[PDB]
Amino acid sequence: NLELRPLGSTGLKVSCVGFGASPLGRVFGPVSEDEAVASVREAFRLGINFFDTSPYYGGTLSEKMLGMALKASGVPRDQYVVSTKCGRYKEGFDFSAERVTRSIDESLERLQLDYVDILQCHDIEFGSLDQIVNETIPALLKLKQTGKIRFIGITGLPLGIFTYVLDRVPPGSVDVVLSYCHFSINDNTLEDLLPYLKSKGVGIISASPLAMGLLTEGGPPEWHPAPPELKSACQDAAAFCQKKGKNISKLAMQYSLTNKDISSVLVGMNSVKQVGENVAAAIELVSAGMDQEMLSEVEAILKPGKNLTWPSGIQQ
């Protein structure tokens, strides 16, 4: 019953909830292996057909667990969409043509796949954007000829990296854009970029619907780089939801799915419960709507931290 959305000009249809395999790359051994197979089986059972990973996640382990889980699924390969990344690894950054040419082979080995649907540059704000335009993207175009990848993407936090690159590449070079932390209750600045991206036929994928933990009752992690004004606004709104006996994670996830110009919202999932929670929240949004009274009250509490971002990347 999960809704599928068109992905730009790719001709692909992805589920509005995407499976982010970032948390699959933890620990090691039978435990995390049977949890990876279990969650992906649940994802397929509930209608999820979009899986995103990166060799950075788990130090290439998340790619391994995802590939084993997708292999154990028994689902035809052309009936789900796989996305992996390149350029960012546990040893650092390398967006060179040589690195990204070797990476797709290393990733496909770990994923046990013959191809990935999308290969995306991972956090280009840590590299020279001119290298991305003139070297990395022309390299991935050649990989697209080999059939090992079918669509090209770029990812990162600051929205400006999308306009900079897409202004300077030949039309059609980039097929997909992956942004994060910019379409949630506290930050919806990705809306400004949608008309720009649709004008070029680029698919739009959002991520971090909970602002990487800011919109959870447990709270943000200790390493979270949000300004203290945003973290205070988010924790007060989570307590407000807690006092009223509701879950701010559900409201934040439902909000991120209200704009169908975003083809899919990737959310990290490592448990069957997490998959069913987000899929049911998406289904509940379509069948029962959204709690407008709760959203209006949470949005007012988050006004002090509205659209507040943080520094990301290097300097150019």
Ligand SMILES: NC(=O)c1ccc[n+]([C@@H]2O[C@H](COP(=O)([O-])OP(=O)(O)OC[C@H]3O[C@@H](n4cnc5c(N)ncnc54)[C@H](O)[C@@H]3O)[C@@H](O)[C@H]2O)c1
């Ligand atoms: N964060 C980055 O640096 C980055 C950059 C580029 C791409 N991405 C892609 O985007 C995907 C999503 O990123 P995120 O995981 O950081 O999003 P997020 O932090 O907003 O929320 C998801 C996280 O909270 C927990 N959670 C999941 N479902 C929940 C529920 N129903 N109730 C309560 N808690 C729940 C999980 O630990 C998960 O990691 C990643 O998996 C990755 O594939 C991430």
